[PDB]
Structure 1
Amino acid sequence: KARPKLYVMDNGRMRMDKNWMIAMHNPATIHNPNAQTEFVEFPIYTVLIDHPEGKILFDTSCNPNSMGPQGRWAESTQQMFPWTATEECYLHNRLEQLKVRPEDIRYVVASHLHLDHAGCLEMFTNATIIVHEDEFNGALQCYARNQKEGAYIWADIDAWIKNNLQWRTVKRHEDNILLAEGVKVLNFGSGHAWGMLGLHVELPETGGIILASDAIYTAESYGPPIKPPGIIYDSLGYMNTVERIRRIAQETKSQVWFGHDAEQFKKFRKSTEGYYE
């Protein structure tokens, strides 16, 4: 029958230029030539699926040692994308509170390898890390070219390699993957980043849930109409992916969980209050 529990874990808050999230949200005009943007706050979160076939983790938030003078993040990154989180927000702690040790995780699904999703991959040395092959390649290049700024953290990648993580790459033209009963990895491909993965979870009580991650930032992104983010890798791929998610949602009667929607996140039942069955 399979009766898993799905947990939403609060991994703190991030701020950044609204223009990153919604491209040209407030363009300058003849009467407002020096138009001002805003510095919006949004949640960073991860999802644990306590499944009888094994524990599945979607995204891993930011590394505890990201911010500060001795942080892994470049100063420019910290100033443009500041992450704030109490100690109880760290992924290791959120898992501990559920009496889950990193070594208990069978599968980690990395939606992508941005600094706010792949922060703690290095913990799960007993898991198979599932990632898009193009995203993996892209990140490894950033590392090889000794890129010290941008959304791919050199020090994080460094740790992945040293900790000898076990990778299973999703091929560009690879079908969706049945990870477990009612759990499907969605191959979104290029869009927001080089290679995006999603989850479709079918819960006996709650029903269908799509984890879109950064494929869809917020409800505003989702529309319709679609309001794309400030910087995109593959604009065409991004638009296709959103509409693909909308279709799947309609066809399977599934909720869509956005990557960084403050309003939606407030309404989630977090790991401090319970779970979804």
Structure 2
Amino acid sequence: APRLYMFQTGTLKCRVCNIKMNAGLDDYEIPVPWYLITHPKGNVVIDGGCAVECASDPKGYWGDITSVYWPVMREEEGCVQALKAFGIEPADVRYVLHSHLHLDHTGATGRFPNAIHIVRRCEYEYAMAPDWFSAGGYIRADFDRPDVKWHLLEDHDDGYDVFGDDTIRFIFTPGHAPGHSSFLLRLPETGPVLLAVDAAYTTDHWDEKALPGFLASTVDAVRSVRKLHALAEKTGALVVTGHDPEAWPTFRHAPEYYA
């Protein structure tokens, strides 16, 4: 039976305004979650956090964007390492899902030899040809690898059911990034779980008290949040924002899980 595990690749250090737009220049620290769904029909990694390379050399691997987001993580938090110690070898992952292709969500890309990588086509196309303000957040070393098998979703694919059994669905949430997608999970005991990811960074974004401090479209972003509100209200899902420092310790992590 399927289970959800919440991991993290350490934290990112930045300023408040990078997360809550225009909220000032104070220091601010957020967890970097990523997810594992163990399913009878194959294992699934979502995003996989920051590249394990960031543990030993952020400036080398990420480059000048470390001026904005400084990652704090240990080697053992790298998604491949974390899965091994958990009992899952790289070859044992059937799918990698990508909410989007920003730097702290492409740690899994190409690190699982048989995994099909599912992302919206327009995120993939934007990641390859970004504008100047967002180029720094796309790490080509992660996602620009010719060996990666991609399933690029189209606009009709909103709601894409990974296994065909309502366990994992893509919920398109454009705004934070062009092809950004959220995920709605249904687990046997827990029921519906809504992973907003970066469609709603924090509880304040969810409550319409802040805007994303980094975004492609504000119009899309706020409409995507209200799309998630309606989905939460309809399903009764448990809502997981993408990075909320206050809410994050209140979820089960680590070896603990949702069934």
TM-score, with length taken from structure 2: 0.92
Deviations 1:77-111 (A, max 9, x none): 11210001122211112111221112111111100
Deviation at 1:174, TM superposition (A): 2.4
Q: Which residue in 2 is equivalent to 1:268?
A: 251
AA aligned to 1:4 is: P
Query: Runs (4+) of structure 1 moved beyond 3 Å?
Result: 145-149
AA aligned to 1:207 is: G
Alpha-carbon distance in 1 for matches of 2:45, 2:132: 29
**Are the equivalent residues in 1 in contact too, given 2:101–2:143 (CA < 8 A)?**
no
Q: Which residue in 1 is equivalent to 2:115?
A: 127
Alpha-carbon distance in 1 for matches of 2:193, 2:175: 21
Q: Which residue in 2 is equivalent to 1:186?
A: 170
Q: Which residue in 1 is equivalent to 2:230?
A: 247
Alpha-carbon distance in 2 for matches of 1:187, 1:202: 13
Alpha-carbon distance in 1 for matches of 2:77, 2:52: 9
Deviation at 1:24, TM superposition (A): 1.7
Matched, 1:216 2:200: yes
AA aligned to 2:61 is: R
AA aligned to 1:275 is: Y
User: What number of residue pairs does the alignment pair up?
Assistant: 257
Q: Which residue in 2 is equivalent to 1:99?
A: 87
Identity of aligned residues (%): 30
Deviations 1:3-29 (A, max 9, x none): 211111121110112111111224xxx
Deviation at 1:176, TM superposition (A): 1.0
Q: Which shifted more, 9-18 or 61-70? A: 61-70
What pairs up with 1:43-54 in 2 under 5 angstroms?
A: 43-54=31-42
Q: Which residue in 1 is equivalent to 2:157?
A: 174
CA change 1:179–1:17 in 2 (3 A) is same
Deviation at 1:208, TM superposition (A): 0.7
Greater Rg by CA: 1
Q: Which residue in 1 is equivalent to 2:14?
A: 16
AA aligned to 1:216 is: A
**Are the equivalent residues in 1 in contact too, given 2:44–2:97 (CA < 8 A)?**
yes
Q: RMSD across aligned C-alpha pairs, in angstroms?
A: 2.1
Deviation at 1:251, TM superposition (A): 0.5
Alpha-carbon distance in 2 for matches of 1:125, 1:198: 24
Alpha-carbon distance in 1 for matches of 2:28, 2:200: 16
Alpha-carbon distance in 1 for matches of 2:141, 2:106: 11
Matched, 1:195 2:183: no
**Are the equivalent residues in 2 in contact too, given 1:77–1:149 (CA < 8 A)?**
no
**Structure 2 unaligned blocks of 5 or more:** none
CA change 1:178–1:154 in 2 (3 A) is closer
Alpha-carbon distance in 1 for matches of 2:221, 2:132: 28
Q: Which residue in 2 is equivalent to 1:56?
A: 44
Deviation at 1:259, TM superposition (A): 1.0
Deviation at 1:125, TM superposition (A): 2.4
